[PDB]
């Protein structure tokens, strides 16, 4: 008769595989746990920078290249400084000796189930998608909206300093208070 709907494999110009997102998902969850269960503080700050890395690679792979590279840039320095403070304020050897009890498991199961079940319907269909007849997203092309495509960083720049400049002024005052306050409480007297 007549099919009329033809599925085909894209030879070039095809995208990434969405298997890789599930790999980064487990690794991010795996590394997130190892941040709190690790006896050594340096090993858990290393799992911390790893955790930020799989989330950044998750963002890069779904086309969020700026915020994904910007997340990584900001936190590599942040984890380095956090490393720098663990070596100044924590006895590494006594912390590794310091342990953890198993009395938190009953609370973990209860708190985990209740919050996750309650916090699930708080999330929309777009996120809960891809949780034997599944759906397929379909995309096509436009010419009027493609005249001068901007990069995401340019799109944020188009509005970050005019339409939403108030968020920048407030953000610059949080940073100023942090610059003045963090120094005021830690400065050596003179």
């Amino acid at each position: 008769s007549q099919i009329s709907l033809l599925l085909l494999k894209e030879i070039y110009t095809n995208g990434s595989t969405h298997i890789m997102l599930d790999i980064l998902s487990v690794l991010a969850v795996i590394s997130g746990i190892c941040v709190i269960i690790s006896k050594n503080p340096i090993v858990s700050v290393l799992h911390l920078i790893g955790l930020f890395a799989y989330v950044s690679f998750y963002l890069i792979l779904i086309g969020l290249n700026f915020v994904g590279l910007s997340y990584l840039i900001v936190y590599i320095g942040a984890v380095s400084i956090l490393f720098l403070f663990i070596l100044m304020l924590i006895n590494i050897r006594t912390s590794e000796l310091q342990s953890n009890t198993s009395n938190s498991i009953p609370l973990t199961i209860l708190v985990g189930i209740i919050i996750s079940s309650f916090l699930f319907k708080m999330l929309p269909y777009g996120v809960i998608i891809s949780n034997k007849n599944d759906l397929f997203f379909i995309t096509s092309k436009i010419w009027d909206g493609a005249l001068a495509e901007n990069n995401h960083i340019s799109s944020i720049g188009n509005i970050m300093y005019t339409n939403y400049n108030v968020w920048l002024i407030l953000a610059s005052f949080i940073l100023l208070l942090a610059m003045v306050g963090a120094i005021v409480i830690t400065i050596k007297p003179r």
Partner: protein, 169 residues
């Protein structure tokens, strides 16, 4: 389908269903990206009113102009096949030299100005079609009518003159 750029596409879906006999049929434009850019100024020199009429139709039917401006669209396609045939009956060596140059130069107009000047003169003397770019600064010479291109990887031969219509050689 969505205008979002895909990040994990591995498959193409095609429909072999044709548009119904009710909608008139328009043969589609057959030119590729390089020939279309080489003749874009000629499109707009002849087809501007229809190009502008189809866009004002869609703005007059917000959210529905795809279905309700099908005749204006058929008209723009016909106007654009007219110039292509015209640029093919005449000035075909010049047209090919320009867009064949454009494909080897990242489709950058400033990298093929000598072939553009030769074609623009041949289009002008057989179609009365001129390249016009609006709001170019009056203090300086138009960029497409400039002897030296600063971003052109190869310098323009001194003996290749820009085409300005009217004034003789």
């Amino acid at each position: 389908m969505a205008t979002r750029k895909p990040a994990f596409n591995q498959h193409v879906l095609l429909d072999t269903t044709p548009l119904p006999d009710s909608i008139p049929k328009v043969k589609e434009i057959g030119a590729s990206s390089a020939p279309l850019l080489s003749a874009s100024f000629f499109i707009g020199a002849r087809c501007k009113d229809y190009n502008d009429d189809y866009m004002q139709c869609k703005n007059e039917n917000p959210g529905r102009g795809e279905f309700e401006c099908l005749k204006e669209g058929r008209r723009v396609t016909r106007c654009a096949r007219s110039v292509l045939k015209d640029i093919n009956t005449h000035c075909l060596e010049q047209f090919r030299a320009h867009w064949q140059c454009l494909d080897n130069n990242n489709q950058q107009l400033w990298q093929c100005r000598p072939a553009e000047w030769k074609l623009n003169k041949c289009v002008y003397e057989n179609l009365k079609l001129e390249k016009v770019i609006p709001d170019q600064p009056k203090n300086s010479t138009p960029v497409h009518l400039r002897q030296r291109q600063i971003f052109a990887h190869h310098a323009i031969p001194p003996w290749e003159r820009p085409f300005i219509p009217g004034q003789p050689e």
